Symmetry: C2
Subunit: 58 residues, 2 copies
Amino acid sequence: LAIRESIESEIRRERERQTNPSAMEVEEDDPVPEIRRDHFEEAMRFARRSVSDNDIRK
Amino acid sequence: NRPNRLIVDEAINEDNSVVSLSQPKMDELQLFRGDTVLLKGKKRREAVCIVLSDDTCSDEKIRMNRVVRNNLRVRLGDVISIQPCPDVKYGKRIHVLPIDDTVEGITGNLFEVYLKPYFLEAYRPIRKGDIFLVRGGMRAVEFKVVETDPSPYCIVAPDTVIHCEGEPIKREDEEESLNEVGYDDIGGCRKQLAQIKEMVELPLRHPALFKAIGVKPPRGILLYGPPGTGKTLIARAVANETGAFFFLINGPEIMSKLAGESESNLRKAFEEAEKNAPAIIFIDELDAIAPKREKTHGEVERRIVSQLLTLMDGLKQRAHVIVMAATNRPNSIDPALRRFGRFDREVDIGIPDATGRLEILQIHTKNMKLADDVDLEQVANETHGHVGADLAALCSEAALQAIRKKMDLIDLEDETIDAEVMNSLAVTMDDFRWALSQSNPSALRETVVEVPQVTWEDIGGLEDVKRELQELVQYPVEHPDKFLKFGMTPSKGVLFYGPPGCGKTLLAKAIANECQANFISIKGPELLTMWFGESEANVREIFDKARQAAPCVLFFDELDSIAKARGGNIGDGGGAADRVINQILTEMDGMSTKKNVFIIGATNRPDIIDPAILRPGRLDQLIYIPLPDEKSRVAILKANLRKSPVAKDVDLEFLAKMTNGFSGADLTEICQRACKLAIRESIESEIRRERERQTNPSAMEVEEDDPVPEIRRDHFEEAMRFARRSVSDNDIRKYEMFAQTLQQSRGFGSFRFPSGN
Ligand SMILES: Nc1ncnc2c1ncn2[C@@H]1O[C@H](COP(=O)(O)OP(=O)(O)OP(O)(O)=S)[C@@H](O)[C@H]1O
Ligand SMILES: Nc1ncnc2c1ncn2[C@@H]1O[C@H](COP(=O)(O)OP(=O)(O)O)[C@@H](O)[C@H]1O
Ligand SMILES: [Mg+2]
């Protein structure tokens, strides 16, 4: 999720901003993301248990 | 239609000189609640009263006490003119005399014991010629106002002296007493008493008017219920209210006679009742006279049944005679008495509920003096399955325990009689707590038909389920006109399904509370009892009770019981066949849709159910109820712990986060286990602190005198490690699979009508 957010931010910020630039270079020059709270908070709802109860009882 | 003319109505307040009126009639008549008004009735007899205001009082009618009612020679439905008097001043002397038949057992002075707190602080307006009643001291006694020096309309002041010198005199022969019973002595059956008033009053009160109407009356009314519900009392009360010539017929008194004497008694009874028209004939224990045809062996009893059938049909002469009859069950009667022109109107007097039981306890504890320890409301909540005669016997037993335990009061009256000793005795709470242990009720086997008390607040979440249930139940009751406009048939039933212990019974009781309807619950053991005993003809007897209590919610719990017990859709070779489910389907197809009887089933195994139930016109809605979510778990933990003292240090919102995948029963289990830990800690602290401290005490008493525990953090913290999940993962996957086998659609989500030109 973090890699997808970083790539889809970078493509828009570089290409979609201006083709012919107003400033000489990119004014930001900063990678935005790191792995933070909302990424775990979103990836939690896909997690599942691999081992059921009867298997543990065996 | 001038507003001083008023029609007599029953009053709720029990004060002996207070009447009540409505607000706009009083504003039109221009009176105030501080006024002391004067009433005029028949035979030039008056009654001065204090009027007040009310919102439950009707406009054209006045509410008054039965004491004021019998002191005017006026019954209900009559007219009374009212005159305001600001000339009502104070009195000079008050001379009243006791009446002999009410003082046959009491003795001593009645002045300070009864009459002094009676006129205290109430400012009672009395009149020469009135008779009032005083309760208290395990006796009710009446006093006639014999002689007053001033004008007859007067207010009793505390300065006015009251003279009680004279012999107890007899009454006038036209005067009434407490020998007969009125409408106040009956509690818990307001609807049935209203129905009997509607059937009986308008023909009997106005015989010439109703004869000019020309519409035929009912002439046979069949009261039935469990034994001890007070049917004889209701009949005697209606007979005393209407004042018609009441004649009593008792079954065993007829059947104890010889051969011709029974027919002679019946014929003389109906002749002497037809002479004194209008009249009421009451036949008690009808099944002792006319049972079923198979049970009346012999000739003479069948001859008596035919005599009764002859006289009931020959009663149709327009003779203003109404015949009532009581029985213990409607099935034992000879079915020839059910025909038209005979006993066709049927009134069901069921067992009373908690408000009714509270009213019965308030009726039976009028005369008995009462200590302030007791709470009759808790007593009425704890008495379950109690008919009113059981409650009267319970009050009797508590009073006898209170008289028994005071053996020093047995020493206080060895053979002498003092009214002050009975005045000095009251009944504690532990007498009632003892009498609940030696009470053997008689109505545990009966089906309970009442409105539930569970609200939506006890259930957490399930908002779309709540919306769909109120759409399916509440809307055809409130708005039938929309269903008439758009023209559809409202659905008849709902099948819930899901994992065990997730609030299906609570949802049924909640929607029954929301719509204010009766609720009839039928568990799995009753269906299995009908299946083993092959007594499936009781299902029609269930649906008849459902029709008699409409609107109603009929709840079949564990509808898969017989299918699970048979082979689990595996053994015996058959498939989805049953005696009992067949009879349920027949009764569902039989009933009309106008009665507003709504049927709800509930299973845990929806695969092994009979598929013929799920057809249209039957249980056709399927609602899935999953395991509760987090906010639902918060609300369940709140609803379980309202009775218990929980310390405010406890975090329930953290408690609902850990318990991913519990049901409701697991949460109730862990709450009750923490409660057990708290009780053990309290008892093993109290025993050590009381006994182990000192046998011979240093101080005079216990220096602490403080119960230590409440339910706190370490109790939940300890009871958590015993909790377990009841429902495994594969079981949940089975319900998800069955939920997907009834899936909506594939590819029809993008349907649109074409829009051209
Ligand atoms: N709802 C009630 N209101 C007032 N008194 C009641 C009520 N239920 C029972 N009682 C009392 O309990 C007794 C019941 O007497 P009954 O009128 O004979 O009852 P019942 O239903 O007629 O019993 P059966 O069928 O004739 S044996 C009387 O003392 C009543 O005063
Ligand atoms: N919405 C809810 N709120 C609170 N408690 C609930 C809820 N649903 C179920 N329960 C718990 O479930 C128990 C009753 O379950 P029940 O209705 O008998 O399930 P079933 O119908 O499967 O037997 C109650 O003790 C109650 O605490
Ligand atoms: Mg009887």
